[PDB]
Amino acid sequence: QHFLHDSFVLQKIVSAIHPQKTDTLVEIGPGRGALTDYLLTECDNLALVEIDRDLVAFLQKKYNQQKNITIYQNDALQFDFSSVKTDKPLRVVGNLPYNISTPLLFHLFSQIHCIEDMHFMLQKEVVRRITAEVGSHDYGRLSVMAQYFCDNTYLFTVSPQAFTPPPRVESAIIRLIPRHNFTPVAKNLDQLSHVVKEAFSYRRKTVGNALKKLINPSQWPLLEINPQLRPQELTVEDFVKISNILN
């Protein structure tokens, strides 16, 4: 676990989020509450989600007199964010390890109607992948799903020296904002997830070969997609189009 301790970074995070007392926030991976201590004065309610028993015990001692802090000892990967009963979508924030980043994001996406926006500290590489340009070596399954669900923005890089103990690599803050008002929509989100997972299973296949069990040769022209391209060359809407012809 890497705990953020640099006050400049911490304040920079608060500024990016711009918490308001209208807001209900959920912080995943609060650590010692370094960021929490800034946030609790700026919002209506702040729920902390953490699986570690010792961390939670420390947090409970720290915040049991704090009216607007609520603490959940739960697995964030299984957490039902709709169980935080409030009138408005939640603002999610947090500090995530690499190994849990994709599954936590996908989990949040599956409940995205519950979520106003997200600000996370992640390993810089993950942020690059989330915000990757079509065609790049960083553009893959994570890129495609995250960019289908959200408009995503790299905000700034954070050096290892900001954390205790320090990570081995650069970190970064990313903003993800659920999209609305776009067309075409994927009519079936499971179909979309399957198409994209299959497409990127073997990155060096042509998409035609990758998806040969799903799309036959006569269908590629209907999608106006060149099946000789590798999947990394397809746009998010290309994948949405693939998904929709299957439903």
2 annotated ligand binder: yes
Main-chain dihedrals φ then ψ at residue 123, nearest 5 degrees: -65, 140
Round to whole Å and give the CA distance between 5 and 178: 29
Cβ atoms of 90 and 115 closer than 8 Å: yes
Cβ atoms < 10 Å from Cβ of 208? 19
Q: Do 70 and 178 fall into the same domain?
A: yes
Round to whole Å and give the CA distance between 200 and 6: 38
80, two tokens: 């039902």
Omega within 30 of 0 (cis) for the link into 165: yes
7: CB partners within 8 A, 6+ apart? none
Round to whole Å and give the CA distance between 24 and 59: 19
4 annotated ligand binder: yes
Cβ atoms < 10 Å from Cβ of 230? 18
Q: How many domains does the chain have?
A: 2
177, two tokens: 């904002």
Q: Do 99 and 167 fall into the same domain?
A: yes
Round to whole Å and give the CA distance between 165 and 5: 10
Nearest to 208 by CA among 176, 170, 242: 242
Q: Do 86 and 200 fall into the same domain?
A: no
DSSP letter, residue 11: H
The CATH number assigned to the domain holding 213 equals: 1.10.8.100
Question: Which of 152, 182, 212 is the C-terminal boundary of a domain?
Answer: 182
Round to whole Å and give the CA distance between 214 and 195: 8
Question: Which of 182, 210, 225 is the C-terminal boundary of a domain?
Answer: 182
Domain residue limits at 1: 1-182
Angle formed by the axes of helices 236-246 and 189-199, to 10°? 120
Nearest to 50 by CA among 2, 10, 82, 95: 95
135 annotated ligand binder: no
SS3 assignment, position 246: helix
26, two tokens: 């959920």
Round to whole Å and give the CA distance between 143 and 134: 9
Round to whole Å and give the CA distance between 105 and 61: 29
Cβ atoms of 149 and 124 closer than 8 Å: no
Fill in the amino acid letter for 133: E
Reported as type and span, the H/E element at residue 100 is helix 98-109
The CATH number assigned to the domain holding 130 equals: 3.40.50.150
